[PDB]
């Protein structure tokens, strides 16, 4: 009573001969990465991603957002290469890297992140909380134009709202201040 | 003339008591045995005699996941490092999928 396997075995692509010539696992991190990469491949037997409920991940949704602008990638890449080459010529940066003391500004990197891959992180955080599942019923979009809203409570600070902040009702009793970049010739509709 | 002695042993009654499909509550022992045969997975704890018991109420599932040994166990460390580039283990794991929620919201008063 022996049944044939319903697919390729995980330890069948290699040969049992000439094992002394093959490169063994010299460390454990490589084996851990191999295991965590093989655990993601769809198998034909009973796996973990089947019984604990996955809400059917293999399912293409519908994008209802704005298309990305047409930007030449080769020009941007060569400009970034020239920039990092001009920045590498400095000796003070080398000394700061050797002395293990080198700090970067937070506002600049925040603005650059919001201008670049900001919308992608906002979309993934919105889909993590299940916003597109309850609002558009599966349909998702990407917020291209950035949005900035800050409440007004005391007299010096502020109460900003980002991608999953926490605002108390006592600090949101009045209408906040919404600020976003826009051109002269387009209307907007705010919904809360 | 009767040289052997001590071969009058008995059965330990070790085996699987709950198969896949039975409604197992919290605390029921899945299977007692020696040596790690069915490694625990999700919501399945262990004891001192290498036993299996459930932690939540639901349906017990038996799947086969990857086996990632602990770095402190040097025996498993060398057993893994002695493997060629592209060798996995894949042992049998026991999982308990929960069905009933751990609580809900109910109205009490109205002031």
């Amino acid at each position: 009573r022996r049944t044939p396997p319903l697919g390729p075995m995980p330890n069948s692509d290699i040969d049992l001969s000439n094992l002394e010539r093959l490169e063994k696992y010299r460390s454990f991190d490589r084996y851990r990465r191999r295991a965590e990469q093989e655990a993601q491949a769809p198998h034909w037997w009973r796996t973990y991603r089947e019984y604990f409920g996955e809400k059917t991940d293999p399912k293409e949704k519908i994008d209802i957002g704005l298309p990305p602008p047409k930007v030449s990638r080769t020009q941007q890449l060569l400009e970034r290469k020239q920039a990092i080459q001009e920045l590498r010529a400095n000796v003070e940066e080398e000394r700061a890297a050797r002395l293990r003391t080198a700090s970067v500004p937070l506002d600049a990197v925040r603005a650059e992140w919001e201008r670049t891959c900001g919308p992608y992180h906002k979309q993934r955080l919105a889909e993590y909380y299940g916003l597109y599942r309850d609002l558009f019923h599966g349909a998702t979009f990407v917020p291209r134009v950035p949005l900035h809203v800050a409440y007004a409570v005391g007299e010096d600070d502020l109460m900003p709202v980002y991608c999953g902040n926490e605002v108390t009702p006592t600090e949101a009793a009045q209408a906040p201040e919404v600020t976003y970049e826009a051109e002269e010739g387009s209307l907007w509709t705010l919904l809360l | 003339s009767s040289k052997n002695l001590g071969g009058k042993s008995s059965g330990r009654r070790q085996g699987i008591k709950k198969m896949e499909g039975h409604y197992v509550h919290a605390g029921n022992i899945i299977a007692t045995q020696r040596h790690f045969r069915w490694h625990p997975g999700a919501h399945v704890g262990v004891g001192k005699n290498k036993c299996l018991y459930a932690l939540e109420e639901g349906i017990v599932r038996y799947t086969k996941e990857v086996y990632v040994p602990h770095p402190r166990n040097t025996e498993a460390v060398d057993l893994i490092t002695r493997l060629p580039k592209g060798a996995v283990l894949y042992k049998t794991f026991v999982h308990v999928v929960p069905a009933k929620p751990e609580g809900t919201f109910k109205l009490v008063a109205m002031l």
């Binding site: 075995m9 094992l19 | 086969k64 002695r82 493997l83 060798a87």
Partner: peptide, 18 residues
């Protein structure tokens, strides 16, 4: 199990010679 198609999946000593 021996009769199930997933038989012999946890084998590991056949890939080593030490």
């Amino acid at each position: 199990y021996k009769t199930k198609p997933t038989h012999g999946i946890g084998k590991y000593k056949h890939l080593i010679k030490a």
